Write a protein that binds this ligand. Structure first.
Ligand code: FAR
Ligand code: MG
Length: 340
């Protein structure tokens, strides 16, 4: 039965301590940087959060442990400070929304959220939340409006589809097979809208014909996979402690009777594989022989993709969403601790 499988995983992983190498070292060509106005933007974010209709203690737990302005600051380290506000607000939205979301309640929330996405990003814009909107939907209307104000319709269409994909993936969601779990996250994970928001952050539009080029599709895919893989390792302690066993490390343990150490090693191996694929795709991009602006846009778009992966790791090593920062030693090696 499913309960026997879950119970045995818990039995095998309980109280295990695993030292994880610094994941940033597995992506050595891709540097991590910090937007220089994070503190100033956080002051704005704190004033804004007072107006958000999410419980005070919940907003504060996210602000304290997640501190998503820092995440935006690492995703978008070269944007101007004026862009940082909407970018930080969006991350507060998606984490609040994911937190707050009972099959009926989920279906209703997803429908109201998809409606907001259509209202704000679709061909007949309406930025006014319907009366009686829940807090995590009401707050999304002005965020999408502000993002759309700094986006071409080309980029807006991609953001719209990507947000629908995220919301519908949440709606749709034996222990599962590890590869089924991985592929589901590759389709469903909320990271692609962050790649598109680099176009907002750096005020440019990547043309569709380049976005659809096999090598650019590959880079987006590889960076999505890399972000998932490192998140599986970095979130293992958090998820195991609330008995959320659908973590890739535990699924490798279950399906293949791997030890927890072997399974983490396997995920780290996949990270290195997909990084090398990603790097090799750059040579195949349709770089222009003449157009500096176009090539700067291609460069910025792929740096945005790479920063999703390095930035999610770097942020995880600089906040307390996933573990206590005392669990890092002086080499940024993480001592996971699956105690309860
Ligand atoms: C799966 C979580 C991560 C890869 C961390 C970075 C992800 C985002 C910034 C958007 C996803 C938001 C969620 C609440 C899952
Ligand atoms: Mg996770």
């Amino acid at each position: 039965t499913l309960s026997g499988e879950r119970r045995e995983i818990i039995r095998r992983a309980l109280n295990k301590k695993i030292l994880v190498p610094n994941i940033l070292e597995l992506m050595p060509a891709w540097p991590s940087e910090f937007q220089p106005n994070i503190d100033e933007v956080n002051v704005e974010i704190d004033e804004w959060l007072k107006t958000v209709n999410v419980a005070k203690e919940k907003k504060l737990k996210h602000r304290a442990r997640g501190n998503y302005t820092l995440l935006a600051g690492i995703y978008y380290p070269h944007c101007r400070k004026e862009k940082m506000l909407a970018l930080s607000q969006f991350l507060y939205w998606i984490f609040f929304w994911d937190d707050e979301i009972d099959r009926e309640g989920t279906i209703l929330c997803c429908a109201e959220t998809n409606k907001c996405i259509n209202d704000c990003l679709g061909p007949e814009p309406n930025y006014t939340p319907p009366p009686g909107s829940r807090g995590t939907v009401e707050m999304l209307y002005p965020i999408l409006r502000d993002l759309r104000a700094g986006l071409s319709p080309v980029s807006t269409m991609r953001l719209k589809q990507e947000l629908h994909d995220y919301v519908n993936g949440v709606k749709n969601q034996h222990l599962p097979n590890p590869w089924d779990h991985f592929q589901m996250r590759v389709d469903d994970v909320g990271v692609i809208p962050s790649i598109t928001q680099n176009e907002y952050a750096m005020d440019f539009t990547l043309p569709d014909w380049i976005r659809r080029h096999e090598a650019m599709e590959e880079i987006v895919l590889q960076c999505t996979k890399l972000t998932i893989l490192l998140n599986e390792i970095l979130s293992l302690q958090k998820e195991f402690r609330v008995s959320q066993l659908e973590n890739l490390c535990l699924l490798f343990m279950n399906t293949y009777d791997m030890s927890i150490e072997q399974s983490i090693h396997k995920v780290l191996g996949l990270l290195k594989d997909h990084y090398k694929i990603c790097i090799e795709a750059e040579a195949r991009l349709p770089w222009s022989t003449t157009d500096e602006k176009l090539n700067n846009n291609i460069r910025e778009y792929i740096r945005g993709c790479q920063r999703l992966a390095t930035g999610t790791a770097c942020w995880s090593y600089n906040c307390e969403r996933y573990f206590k920062l005392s669990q890092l030693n002086d080499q940024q090696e993480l001592l996971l601790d699956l105690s309860r």
